Design a protein around this ligand. Structure first.
Ligand code: UN9
Ligand code: MN
Length: 221
C-alpha cells in the first residue's frame, strides 16, 4: 500500500480519534522475515544488553534481568533492512505531517530494538514522555511470527486516558503500531514467556523539542 493511502485514509483519522493506530502486514512476509533475521543475528552475536535489572539479590547470580536492548542507526552492516523499515516509517510520518493533532514532526530517534527474553518479565506501567522531552509519537514494529498471547503472554496493554477500558495489542509479525507518547497513553508490557522482539522509533514535535532544549542547556565566553 502506498504510504500515502495508508496515512491519509487510516493512520491520520485513527490517531486523531483514538490516539492509537494498528497497521497489520506493513512490509509483507519477505521483508518482515529479513528484518527478523537481522534482529535475531544481532541477538545471537551478542549485540544486545544483558537486560533490565528487575530484581537485585545479595547474591548477584540470582539477579533477574528483563528486556534487552540495542540502539540501531540503520546504516550498520547487517542492519540495512532495519534501515529500510526506518525509512518506511519516516515516509508514513512525512505523509501525515501537519495532520497528526497540531504537531509538526521534524525529527526522530535512532531505533531501539528490544528483546523480552521469555523469562516471565514484562515492562511496568509507564508514560513514554511525561515531562515534555519532545517526543509526540511512538512507532513500534513487531517481528514475532505466529505469536499466540494465550500461551506466550507479552501483550502490550494501553490504558487510554478518560476511558474505562483497555487496548490490548498482540506483538504480531509485521504489525506496525502508532500511539501518542504523552500522558494520554500509559501502557505496559504483560509478562512474556517466549522471546519477543520489537523495534521502536520516537518522533519529535518541533515546538516541544525546541523548548525542551532550555531544560538541558554551550559557547565559550
Ligand atoms: O514492546 C512493546 O510492545 C511496548 N514497549 C514499551 O512500552 C517500552 N517502553 C519503554 Cl520506555 C522502554 C524503554 C526501554 C526498554 C524497553 C522499553 C519498552 O519495551
Ligand atoms: Mn513504552
Amino acid at each position: 500500500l502506498p504510504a500515502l493511502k495508508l496515512a491519509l485514509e487510516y493512520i491520520v483519522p485513527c490517531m486523531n480519534k483514538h490516539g492509537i493506530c494498528v497497521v497489520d502486514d506493513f512490509l509483507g512476509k519477505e521483508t518482515g522475515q529479513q528484518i527478523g533475521d537481522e534482529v535475531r543475528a544481532l541477538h545471537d552475536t551478542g549485540k544486545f544488553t544483558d537486560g533490565q535489572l528487575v530484581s537485585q539479590k545479595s547474591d548477584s547470580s540470582k539477579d533477574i534481568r528483563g528486556d534487552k536492548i540495542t540502539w540501531i542507526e540503520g546504516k550498520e552492516p547487517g542492519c540495512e533492512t532495519i534501515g529500510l523499515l526506518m525509512s518506511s516509517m519516516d515516509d508514513l510520518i512525512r505523509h501525515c505531517n501537519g495532520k497528526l493533532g497540531s504537531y509538526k514532526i521534524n525529527g526522530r530517534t535512532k531505533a531501539m530494538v528490544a528483546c523480552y527474553p521469555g523469562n516471565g518479565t514484562g515492562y511496568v506501567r509507564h508514560v513514554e514522555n511525561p515531562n515534555g522531552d519532545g517526543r509526540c509519537v511512538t512507532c513500534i514494529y513487531y517481528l514475532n511470527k505466529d505469536w499466540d498471547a494465550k500461551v506466550s503472554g507479552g501483550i502490550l496493554r494501553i490504558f487510554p486516558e478518560g476511558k474505562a477500558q483497555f487496548a490490548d495489542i498482540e506483538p504480531k509479525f509485521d504489525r506496525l503500531l502508532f500511539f501518542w507518547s504523552d500522558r494520554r497513553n500509559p501502557h505496559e508490557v504483560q509478562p512474556a514467556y517466549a522471546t519477543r522482539y520489537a523495534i521502536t522509533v520516537w518522533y519529535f514535535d518541533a515546538d516541544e523539542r525546541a523548548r525542551a532544549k532550555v531544560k538541558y542547556l554551550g559557547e565559550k565566553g
